[PDB]
Ligand binder design. Sequence first.
Ligand SMILES: Nc1ncnc2c1ncn2[C@@H]1O[C@H](COP(=O)(O)OP(=O)(O)O)[C@@H](O)[C@H]1O
Ligand SMILES: Nc1ncnc2c1ncn2[C@@H]1O[C@H](COP(=O)(O)OP(=O)(O)O)[C@@H](O)[C@H]1O
Ligand SMILES: [Mg+2]
Ligand SMILES: [Mg+2]
Lengths: 436, 436
Amino acid sequence: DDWSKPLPPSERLEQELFSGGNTGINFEKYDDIPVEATGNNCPPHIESFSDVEMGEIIMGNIELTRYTRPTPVQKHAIPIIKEKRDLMACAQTGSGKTAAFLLPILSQIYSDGPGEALRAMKENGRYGRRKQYPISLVLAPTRELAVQIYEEARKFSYRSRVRPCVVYGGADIGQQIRDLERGCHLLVATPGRLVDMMERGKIGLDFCKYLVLDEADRMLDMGFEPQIRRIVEQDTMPPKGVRHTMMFSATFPKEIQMLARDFLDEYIFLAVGSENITQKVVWVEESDKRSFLLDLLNATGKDSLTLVFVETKKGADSLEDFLYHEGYACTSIHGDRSQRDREEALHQFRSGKSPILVATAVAARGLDNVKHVINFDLPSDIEEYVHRIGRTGLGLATSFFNERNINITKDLLDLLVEAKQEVPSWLENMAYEHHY
Amino acid sequence: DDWSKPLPPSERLEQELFSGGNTGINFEKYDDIPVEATGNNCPPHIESFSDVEMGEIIMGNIELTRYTRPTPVQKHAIPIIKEKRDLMACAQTGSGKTAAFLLPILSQIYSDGPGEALRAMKENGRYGRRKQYPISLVLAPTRELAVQIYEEARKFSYRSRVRPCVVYGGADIGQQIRDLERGCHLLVATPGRLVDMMERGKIGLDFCKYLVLDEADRMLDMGFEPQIRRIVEQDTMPPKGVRHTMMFSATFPKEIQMLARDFLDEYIFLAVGSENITQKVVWVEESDKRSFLLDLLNATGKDSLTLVFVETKKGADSLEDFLYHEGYACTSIHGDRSQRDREEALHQFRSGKSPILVATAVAARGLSNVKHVINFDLPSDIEEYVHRIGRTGLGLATSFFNERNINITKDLLDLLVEAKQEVPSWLENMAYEHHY
RNA sequence: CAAGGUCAUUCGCAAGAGUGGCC
RNA sequence: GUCAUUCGCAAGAGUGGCCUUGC
Ligand SMILES: Nc1ncnc2c1ncn2[C@@H]1O[C@H](COP(=O)(O)OP(=O)(O)O)[C@@H](O)[C@H]1O
Ligand SMILES: Nc1ncnc2c1ncn2[C@@H]1O[C@H](COP(=O)(O)OP(=O)(O)O)[C@@H](O)[C@H]1O
Ligand SMILES: [Mg+2]
Ligand SMILES: [Mg+2]
């Protein structure tokens, strides 16, 4: 019985599962991703589903649901889970958390098969068996979330021998029991309803190899902690390091961290996701950047430090000489500068003898109370912009923009909206005109 | 013993196998390909290796060999073989053709395992068994090519339980026997040396499931046909439809077709690959295309048909009225024309009453003895260019080119070189400056 | 030497746009 | 309604170019 071999299709079933619902979304607004996965021997992230062998069944079902590339949380979660490592993932709503665990878990089940224990037991007959032993257990806080997880499981278990089931409180136990008795390899459950099934001898967790806690922060908020601990610690479920455990949550309070240390073994912490700073963006042609900078400098207080960012080292030297001949006390720093020359420049800047510092990205990585940060040249990527403006200690950041910075028009626009800053209407216009 | 699981690496092996040699070549000057695969229920081609699940070992070894995407012959051969169909593949030398069969075959062996027959026999001890039963046999005409096939097999069998071996004539039979005695699952062989090995009781073909005849045209020219027939038809090799047979050849003579019908079962025919047409390319700005066309028409003999291709239906109507108001008897045809209007236009064209036909791509698909085809607008792709100029019978083709046609500068340059035509120096110059 | 970003060409993919051809 | 090509944007990869940073 090979579980990696797809079973014959059903045109009827395909339409019910894939025609509508949660098909793929363009996760491009978010593609400028701050994502970090820290842990011992952390498996590297993926850029395509092909970078790991999901298997024939999963790749075909991904093609039916119309996903093309992994979401940023999936880029890390999928290789982490397929390497059989535990995962603590803090990801905001709409990141693709559900598929981030369903895809690797089901892929592993297809490759490994049901295991020796299930074969050694009486095969689930046409009249079923009273008690079922799920290979994988997913815990959810509500019926709504549990049903949504279950629906995605059907899409990814299409043409497989994995039969998903879902049980939730506030419903008829009779339907759920009768649905369980037809086989259950992946179970989605609210905690209270799952405890009832275990007490009734309908569900056994002796062979549960994949445990997922979805929306874990909410489950604690709703008072499900005793049920979860009864499910995991006070029963037959294999312990940490034998089972493969994953916790997903939108927030990371200390209550979730303490639960992670109790439930997860040698795990990876995965996190996905500047408002005390006034930010201005102005259109400036290249030949006008110097004159625009002079007006800002002529408007600066007597004892306010100004940090001016430029793209190239030659541009930094050229801008320093220009400002000096214009009569402005300034200094400069870049990568070619010796450590002594950097110290001399910073000494003048900190002392205030030269309250203007012309710097490349060398000062974006903090070498040291700057009041004004000026992007004389905007950086080529939005990550550099964040590091630059964070040098302020009220704090102001002014950036020069022209057609050369069109590569960050949307990324900069998203940042201004996200930081509750004010948005030039022409920036929105150029963004939509350039991308649609 | 799971054969889909990679075995531990070896830094030495990686360097010896992958550091140099024939790593990937960008099959980019040949992205524009005439490739047709014809046969009953022919599996669709692929565009990346991900489109079929090759397995962890294969995808890992592909990355080490620096292959990015399948070559045009690989796009069809890989899915055809992976679906267990026989293949008659005619492709020129240097097409990525060795890997076109090694990758799907080894992937199948990794997934299917060694089969029941091998598991029921004595394991190859460290004093290995005497007689070997290769799962896959590859036949080559010379030692040189056989070694070259074998070396690629080493790279793709890296970290696998598949052990390749190569035997060829004009060498010490002694080394080959004891290299075989250490185990052999995939065998590369020249026909003469293989016949000897069978007669020694060293090689058994009872379990060979994948038979490959590489450079089959040369093998027949070198007199290997009786040895091949003895190898395939007069021994224990499983017959067609049980074994999976592939034949590769740079040419497709009648002698190869007859051999394919004898050896291949329900096979697919795969083929990969205008000199009596003088072709001219001239730079013409858009505002000058009408004046340039007039000079050519005034230089046309009184009784010669000219076919003028344009991009849009509106362009066809506009060009017709312009020529008419200039005193040139002409007509036009495009997709929006009713069948009656098309017949009227063709009637005037073939009678010579209006020897100038202004047409869109609607006339690029055969509808006469046209003496001059003029690309007033060059098509957006080179395939359309071939179909347009093919309407001549001496026949001449003159094409207008400007910056709008930069998207086919390289493809048109390759075509003119391929068809032994004169090449404007500016066309090469613009091609290299645009792509490098 | 290593690490990062952007651009140009190419390949696939998704969304859009434009042209063409078939009914 | 179906089909083909091109172009814009976006993801990735390969090549090239360019810039930045660390010894
Ligand atoms: N690889 C992907 N590509 C495109 N869209 C995806 C992908 N993975 C998930 N999605 C979509 O993201 C949306 C959110 O799914 P969901 O799991 O509910 O996010 P979350 O659970 O973190 O709130 C769904 O519409 C889903 O189809
Ligand atoms: N998918 C690929 N991507 C890039 N290069 C490839 C690919 N496949 C093969 N090649 C290269 O193409 C060249 C031709 O290999 P070969 O099999 O001998 O062509 P052929 O057999 O048609 O004469 C080799 O250098 C090989 O490494
Ligand atoms: Mg060859
Ligand atoms: Mg092109």
